[PDB]
Symmetry: D2
Subunit: 359 residues, 4 copies
C-alpha cells in the first residue's frame, strides 16, 4: 500500500489537459480539428494546442510530434500557486521522481510540476496558464458535434485498490466502482470537480492511458459525430458506442485517433460535489453496468490502451495484472453476465450479449 | 413470375395497421401500452386496439389473443371506397384467395378485403374507418419516448426480385435496395406515401413478418425507449441498435415484444414523393449499409421473424431461400465487409465488425 | 368568384423553389449561405442557386439581382412533362397571362410555365429539372442549424375564401384554417404533398409574399439559428419566435433577410395525405392558435410582406382587404383574445398577451 | 457597508432547497407534481417535500401551507457539521438574528441554522440530511419535461454592491454582472458549486425572492413544459421565454405557480469552478444581455416577486431601491437598448424590442 504523506495534499480543481505524443502531426490535426472540431490556440511544425468550446485556459489537449505515440502528461489544475509547491513536497514524500519548470513544459502553462506517480503515470500540476477567448457563446463557430469541455482521463493499472487509496489521500472521492463478490475491484471512478469523475482506474496491464474524454451539450451532438464519421467513411474508427453508461449514467461514444489513442465523447452525468455523495457499486457480471442497454463491450476496449512516458520521454514498462480480468469473467470462455440478478433468462454463459462471441 | 393484371391496381395511400396474434393479452398490453405508451382506442378480453400519438384513424395495431403468435393481417388504406372493389378484381385476376367483409374484420374498419397474396402474405385493403380524437397536441399525455406514427412493414420473402416486380405493379416505387456485384438482390424498400417505404422485402425463408415500425419526433425519443428498457431491467429485449441506418438514413432501434414480434422505432428519413426520386443501390459488403456507423448486425436480425397466417388462421408454410444469404456473405465464417470499397484497412473477413464473431 | 376550368388541373407534387429578387447579391449570399448554410448549386455575378440538405432537384431558392426586392416566382413541381401543357391550358381558360419557356426561366429547370395567377401571384409549373447530388447523408457538411427541405410558401391575399376555392380546384386540400363566429376567414393552409401545407393564405393586402419556409430535423436546429444570430449580433433580424404553432403544431422561427424577405424555419408537423384528413378550424380570438404558448404576435408579422412581380418584372398592384383584420380583432384597440374560452382570467383586451 | 467578520466563513457547498409558503396545498401539489413532475419524498396535510430526478438529499423544495404566500427559507448545504457552528459564529458577529435547531426545522434535515441575513433574507445552513433513493436512472419515471436538479435562487435587493460584497466575504464568487457607464450595478450572479450561480442579486425593492430555478438535461425538455402548459390550457402562467440567456448562456423558461411564486427552468450553463474564472460584465442597455435573441423582457418580470419571512414567520418590510431601475432605463418611456453597440439600426427608444 501507498502510505499517506504527512505533507498536505495539493488542492486539485479538475483535470485540465493532456499532452499526447503523435507520430504524424498533420494526420492528427485532421482528426482533432477537421473531424472533431477542436479549436486551435497555437500550432507549429512540432505541436498543436487545442481547446474545447467553453474553455478559457490556454488548451485542453497538446499534440506533440514524436517517434513513439504515447501519453506524455495528464495535467490537473490546482487552486493556487502555492499548491504546486505542495504537490512537489507531497510526491517527494511518496518517493516519486519530480521535475519542476518555472516557465512550463508546454506553451501557455507557467510554473508546472511533472511527476512519475506511484502507479507509473506522468501527472502534471500547475496553476499559472495563459487565458484565451472563451468561445462559449460563439455560436457562429459551433459545430453540430461541438466538444464543449474536457471531462476526464481514464488510466489502466493492474491493482485498482492500491491506486484508489492513493487517489483518495490526494483528495479524489470515489463516486462509482465495479466489484465482484470475491473481493476483486475491476474499476473505480473518482472526482474533484463535482462530476462523476476527473480520472478513473480500469483494471489491466499498466501503466497505460485508456482514454481522454470530452463533453458535449446534448446527446444529438454525439450522434452527429458518429454520422460525420460515416460520411467521411472512417466508421472503422468508431470503437464502441454510442450508448448509455450504467456507471456514470452518461451518454457516450469511443473513437480512435490516428495513433490509436482512444477518445471518449460524454454527456449528462450527475452532481457529485457533496462530500457524502452516495458511492454506487456495480457487480462485474451485471450486463447493464457499462452499457445500460446491454450492448456488448468490444474486446479491444478491455485489451488496448496507450503507452505512457516517463519524465525522460521513454516508455514506461508494463506490469501485468494478476487480479481477475473483467473481459475474462464477463465475455470470455468461462464468463458470465446477467440482465436480472438471479434470473437465468437474459443471462449469458461464455459469450457476449446480443448474439456475439469474442473474435 | 407474377403477371401484371389487366385490371387496374387499387390506389394505395399508406400502410395503416397490423393485426398481430399474441398468446398472453395482458403481457402484450404491458409491453405496448405501459412500456411503449401506445394509446388504447378499444379493448376487451379478446383484443386491444392501439394507435400512435398523431393518428386519426381508429388504430395502427390490433393485438388479437390466439393460440399461435403470428401476423394475421397487414393493412393498407386505399384512396376511395371504389379502390376496395379494384383490389378485389386485381387479386382475383392474379388467382389469389380473397375474402370481402362489408362491415370489416376488426373493429373500427368498415368494408374491407383480405387476400392471401402471391408471396403468401395476408394483406388487407380498406377505405372506411372510424375516426378518433387525434392526439397530436395532447402534450399532457406525451411520453419521453412517444410513438407518433405508424411508418412501415418489413416482409421476409425468398425471392426479392419476384416480390419487387409484383409490388411495383401494385404502384409501390422502389427507393433503395441492396445487391451484390453478381446480380443477387438481398433487400428492397418501396413506398406509396412519400417516405422511404410503406413496406420492404428482406431476402430469407418466408413468408414471415420481419417487423412493424413506428416513428418518433426526435432521436432522443428513441434513446429514451432504450433507457426505459434498462430501468425496467428488460434490456435483453433490445435486439439491435440504436443506430443510424445507411439505407433510409433513419435513426432506429429494434425491440422484441413478449411473443418475439419485432418492433422498429424509426425517425428522420427523407422525402420520396417525386416520381423520378433517385434510387439508391448499396453493395451487400458495404459495412455502412445497414448501420451507418459500422456496428455489427446481430445474427438474430437475419434469421428470426414472425409466422404469418392464411385467411383461415393457419400458419403459412415456409419456403426456403435459394439465393445467397446476407448473413453468410457478410458476417459468417466465409463472409466479408468493408468500410471503404477496395481498402483492406477497416475490412472484416469471417467475422462481424468491431471485434465480434457469431455467437 | 374564380370559375373552375373544364380543362383538367395539372397534377402538382409539391412546392419546389422560389425566385427572390434581391438588391445586393453579396449581402444576400452572406445571409443564405454563411448564416443559414444553404448549399450552392450554381452561382455567377447575377444569381445564386441554393438548395437544402435533402434536395435532389437543382435548387429550392434562386436569388436574382435586381432593382426592387420582390418575389419573382413561386414554383411548384408537377408529376409529368404533360402536366405543364395541362397547366398552360388551365390558366389560359382562367383568362390569365401566361409565358411558356421550353428551356426554362432559370438554370437547372427545363420546360416551364409562368403565370400571373388569379390572385396576382407569379406561379411557375415545371417537371424537368437537373438532378444534383442529394446531400442527405453528407454529415461532413451538416450544420448545427441545417435546413433540410423546402416546406411551403405563405401568400397574403385580401379574400381568403376566394383564393381557397381556387386552390381547392387546383387540387390543394385545406388542412387548417382560422375563422370567427361571424363567419370571417382570416387564414387557410392547404397541401399537395401530405404535410400541413405547400402554400397558405393569410388575409391581408395583396398580392404579397408573406414568407418561404424551410424545415429542420429537430427543434434544437431552430434554436441554433437563433443562437447564431445572437453571436453575429443580428438578433434584430429575428422577428417572431421561436415558438410552437397552434395551427400545424410545428416548432417555428421567423427571420428577415437583407431585403426584409421573411423566412420561416419549421419542423415537426403531421401527416395529411389521407383524403378525409380531419380539417381543424381555430377561432381567431384563441390566443393559442398561432403561438401555442400564448406568446404575442408582433404587429409587423401581420402588416409586412414582400412585393411580388408580374411577368414583365414590374411590381404587382396591391388590393386592400375589406374583411375584418386579424390584427385589429385580436391585438388592436378594440381587439381581444382568450386562453380558455369564456374565461376572463388569461384574456387580453385592447392589447396583446404577456 | 457590511463588515467582514473575523470569524471564518462556513464552507458552503451549493444551494440545496427552498421552503415556500403556499395558500392552497392541493393546488400547489397539482402544479409541482402533476404539471412539473417533481418527486414526492414525503407529504402530509400541511407540507409536501419534493425532489428533483437526480437528487439524493431528502428534498429540494418544501411546500408549507400557511396564510401568506412567501419564501420561508433558502437553504445551502455546508461541507461538514462543524461548518454549521462556523455559520452561527459568523452571523452572530454580523449582528444578525439566528436560530439553531439540532433536529432541524423541516423533515429530512438535521442540525440546522436559520438566520435573518444582512439583506433581510431567511438563509438556512445545514449538513445533516436524510438520504433518499437517487432517481437518476429511473427512466421508467422520467417525464418528457423532467426536472433533474435544483440550480439556484435569485433575490431582489435594493443595493446590489452592498449585497455582493457580503456574499463575496461568505465565499461566493461573482461570475457575471450587469452595470452601466455611470457606476450603477443592476444585477450580479455568484456561485459556490462551479456553475454560473447558486444565488443571484437583482436590483429592486426588497427583500423579495425573484425565483427558484431547476435544471433539465436538454433544451427540448423545456420546450415540452411549454407544450404541456398549452395542452392544459394554462399558457397564461408562462411569464417569459423560452429563450437563451445572455448572462449565463443557459436555455430558460419562467413560469408562475398558483401563488405567483416564479419558477425558472434552466439548462446548459458553463463551468466556473476555477478561482480566476473570467468575470463577464454586460451593459444594461445591451438588448442581448437577458435574452440573447433580443426578445423583450415583460415588465412583470422586473416588478413582481415573492414576499420573504423573518424567523418569526412575519413578512419582511420592503425597502425601496433608489439606484436606477433596469425596467425604466431599458423599456420605460425614457428607456434605451441596442443590438449592436453604437449602431442606431436595431436600437430601441422608449419601448421594448420587437414592436
Ligand atoms: O438496416 S437497414 O439500413 O438496411 C434498414 C433501413 C431501414 C429500415 O426501416 C430497416 O428496417 C432496415
Ligand atoms: O402562426 S400560425 O400558427 O398561424 C402558422 C402555422 C403554420 C405556419 O407555417 C405559419 O407560417 C403560421
Ligand atoms: Ca463470483
Ligand atoms: Cl463503460
Ligand atoms: Cl435574464
Ligand atoms: Fe470515460
Ligand atoms: Fe424497418
Ligand atoms: Fe409558415
Ligand atoms: Fe435564474
Amino acid at each position: 500500500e501507498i502510505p499517506k504523506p504527512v505533507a498536505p495534499a495539493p488542492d486539485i480543481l479538475r483535470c485540465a489537459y493532456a499532452e499526447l505524443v503523435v507520430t504524424d502531426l498533420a494526420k492528427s490535426r485532421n482528426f482533432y480539428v477537421d473531424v472533431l472540431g477542436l479549436h486551435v490556440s497555437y500550432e507549429d511544425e512540432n505541436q498543436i494546442y487545442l481547446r474545447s468550446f467553453e474553455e478559457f485556459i490556454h488548451h485542453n489537449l497538446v499534440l506533440t510530434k514524436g517517434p513513439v505515440a504515447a501519453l506524455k502528461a495528464m495535467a490537473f489544475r490546482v487552486r493556487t500557486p502555492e499548491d504546486v509547491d505542495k504537490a512537489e513536497a507531497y510526491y517527494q514524500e511518496l518517493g516519486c521522481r519530480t521535475e519542476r519548470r518555472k516557465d512550463g513544459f508546454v506553451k501557455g502553462i507557467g510554473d508546472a510540476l511533472r511527476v512519475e506517480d506511484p502507479l507509473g503515470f506522468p501527472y502534471e500540476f500547475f496553476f499559472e496558464t495563459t487565458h484565451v477567448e472563451r468561445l462559449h457563446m460563439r455560436y457562429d463557430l459551433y459545430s453540430a458535434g461541438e466538444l464543449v469541455r474536457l471531462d476526464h482521463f481514464n488510466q489502466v493499472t493492474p491493482d485498482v485498490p492500491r491506486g484508489r487509496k492513493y487517489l483518495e489521500d490526494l483528495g479524489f472521492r470515489v463516486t462509482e466502482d465495479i466489484q465482484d463478490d470475491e473481493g476483486t475491484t475491476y474499476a473505480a471512478w473518482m472526482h474533484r470537480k463535482g462530476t462523476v469523475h476527473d480520472t478513473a482506474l480500469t483494471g489491466g496491464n499498466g501503466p497505460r492511458l485508456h482514454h481522454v474524454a470530452f463533453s458535449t451539450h446534448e446527446k444529438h451532438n454525439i450522434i452527429q459525430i458518429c454520422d460525420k464519421m460515416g460520411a467521411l467513411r472512417i466508421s472503422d474508427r468508431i470503437e464502441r458506442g454510442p450508448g448509455r453508461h450504467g456507471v456514470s449514467n452518461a451518454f457516450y461514444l469511443y473513437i480512435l485517433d490516428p495513433d490509436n489513442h482512444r477518445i471518449e465523447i460524454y454527456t449528462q452525468d450527475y452532481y457529485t460535489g457533496d462530500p457524502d455523495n452516495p458511492t454506487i457499486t456495480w457487480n462485474v457480471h451485471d450486463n447493464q453496468r457499462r452499457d445500460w442497454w446491454g450492448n456488448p463491450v468490444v474486446p479491444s476496449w478491455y485489451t488496448e490502451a496507450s503507452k505512457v512516458l516517463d519524465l525522460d520521454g521513454n516508455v514506461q514498462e508494463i506490469i501485468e495484472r494478476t487480479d481477475d480480468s473483467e473481459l475474462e469473467v464477463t465475455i470470455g470462455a468461462d464468463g458470465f453476465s446477467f440482465t436480472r440478478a438471479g434470473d437465468e433468462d437474459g443471462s449469458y454463459h461464455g459469450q457476449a450479449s446480443k448474439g456475439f462471441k469474442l473474435g
